[PDB]
Write a protein that binds this ligand. Structure first.
Ligand SMILES: [Ca+2]
Ligand SMILES: [Cl-]
Length: 512
């Protein structure tokens, strides 16, 4: 089929945030620009001794899981925050410019490593230390592990003491206000048996964000870290939602408006990034696309289309969101409208997401598309979450397609520009320019079609004169990014490139 692509390097310009190419889990061979330590294990992580609790993901088990996961040596097992310092040390060693780390708000953190806890061990008990936000006495780099409490200000202070402020080269840049708070009772029944109130989340986010700003005025806060659309909507059927709803379309408006009001009252921004998790509910072939089963072709197809629910008002996905909450899709324009109406200047983060089929071309194309979307639509931060025991070779290809396509860490541009394809069903196209190198334009082009090749007819409107194009890509035959044939000929900033089915490509155009 033929598809036209119209690029204008002087229209619809948008700064691409460098921190969209992040992860929660390290890749064996993929370039990242941001890393998070967060998720379910964060809520009951004790910084004083590194103990944590799995909650209902793993038998309410209190253990050394985070010590092993983050490769803390045995002689640092009892060093405060050794899990977080191993983590941020690795960020620095890798040259990764942004670490997002999680602080605790659930209410209690593991006191020991006694294994699976009984329902009788519900907090408060000898199994739990109480979280407090403020110590109200002098801070120590050697916190007391023998009392019944753990202090968040003392924790951040330890980290800043080691690394300095976020304003400097080594500082941790971001702090997450715990994790998935409306799921505290079902993920962490032993910490937080009761449903989380809208007023409770607001208050805890507000007070925890004030601790961060006190200790590191330059550090950024991420909240509320909502699990999914149900929490965006009515904070997962929060018992107090009816009484605080008023005119608010959804909990996101309530949350933004009140953080704005709370920030104005405190005299400083307390929320830097509205932080959200997005595991697509989109289905194909009767399956949610997050599945690892790639034998299901209609599921594979839905997977590559699913990123369209983030931005495209013409796309309808097969899900309960698509059926019952059409008002909330496409997601990013909706959230962006809420930000512009309730808390202007707030950034948007996706600290967990995963499109499934990680070891399949449909999983790589969907991941490549999600990364394009984040960059085109003003996402500040995003961190992929691993769902398939590191069987993620095509996910890694997508990351490398952007920032290490040639194995020499050549990267995508920092400025998104107008790049309109005539077929959004069968293709995705992103173009970028690099603010300090006018010699080049970078284009991501994917053929989402399962069987047919696409002749892409490119029309670049620019004052630059591009004369050569190089091409790198992956496809259904290999996750390995191979250098493909050069662009044939460029005449008057126009050229053609034929892409086979299920292929994702990075095109580099040069004036010279
Ligand atoms: Ca203590
Ligand atoms: Cl949540």
């Amino acid at each position: 089929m033929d598809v036209n692509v119209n690029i204008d390097t002087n229209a619809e310009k948008q700064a691409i945030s460098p921190y969209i190419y992040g992860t929660n889990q390290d890749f064996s061979n993929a370039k990242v620009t941001a890393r998070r330590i967060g998720g379910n294990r964060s809520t009951g992580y004790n910084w004083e001794n590194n103990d944590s609790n799995a909650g209902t993901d793993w038998k309410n088990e209190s253990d050394n899981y985070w010590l092993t996961l983050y490769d803390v040596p045995k002689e640092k097992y009892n060093e405060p925050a050794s899990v977080y310092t191993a983590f941020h040390d690795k960020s620095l060693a890798m040259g990764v410019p942004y670490s997002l780390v999680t602080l605790q708000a659930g209410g209690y953190v593991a006191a020991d490593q006694s294994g699976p806890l009984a329902n009788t061990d519900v907090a408060p008990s000898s199994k739990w230390k109480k979280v407090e936000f403020n110590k109200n006495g002098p801070l120590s780099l050697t916190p007391d592990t023998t009392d019944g409490s753990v202090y968040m200000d003392e924790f951040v202070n330890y980290l800043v003491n080691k690394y300095g402020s976020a304003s400097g080269s080594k500082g941790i840049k971001g702090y997450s206000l715990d994790n998935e708070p409306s799921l505290w009772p079902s993920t962490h029944p032993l910490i937080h048996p009761d449903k989380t109130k809208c007023s409770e989340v607001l208050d805890k986010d507000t007070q925890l964000a004030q601790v961060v700003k006190k200790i590191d005025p330059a550090a950024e806060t991420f909240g509320p870290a909502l699990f999914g659309f149900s929490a965006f909507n009515d904070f997962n059927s929060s018992p107090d939602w009816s009484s605080v709803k008023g005119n608010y379309q959804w909990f996101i408006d309530y949350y933004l408006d009140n953080m704005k009001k709370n920030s104005d009252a405190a005299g400083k921004r307390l929320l830097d990034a509205l932080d959200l998790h997005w595991y697509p509910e989109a289905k194909g072939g009767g399956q949610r696309v997050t599945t690892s089963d790639t034998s299901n072709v209609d599921c594979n197809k839905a997977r590559m289309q699913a990123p369209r629910s983030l931005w495209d008002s013409t796309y309808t996905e097969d899900s309960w969101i698509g059926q019952w909450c059409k008002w909330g899709l496409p997601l990013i324009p909706k959230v962006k409208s809420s930000i512009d109406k309730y808390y202007p200047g707030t950034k948007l983060s996706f600290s967990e997401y995963n499109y499934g089929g990680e070891d399949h071309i449909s999983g790589g194309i969907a991941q490549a598309d999600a990364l394009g979307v984040f960059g085109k639509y003003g996402v500040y931060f995003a961190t992929y979450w691993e769902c398939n025991s590191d069987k993620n070779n095509y996910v890694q290809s997508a990351f490398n397609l952007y920032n290490n396509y040639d194995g020499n860490n050549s990267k995508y541009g920092d400025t998104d520009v107008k790049c309109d394809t005539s077929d959004i069903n069968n293709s995705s196209t992103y173009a970028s320019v690099t603010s300090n190198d006018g010699n080049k334009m970078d284009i991501i082009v994917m053929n989402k079609n399962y069987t047919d090749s696409i002749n892409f007819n490119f029309n670049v409107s620019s004052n630059k004169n591009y004369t050569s194009g190089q091409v790198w890509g992956f496809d259904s035959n290999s996750s390995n990014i191979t250098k493909r044939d050069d662009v044939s000929s460029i005449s008057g900033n126009k050229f053609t490139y034929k892409i086979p089915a299920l292929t994702a490509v990075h095109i580099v155009l040069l004036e010279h």
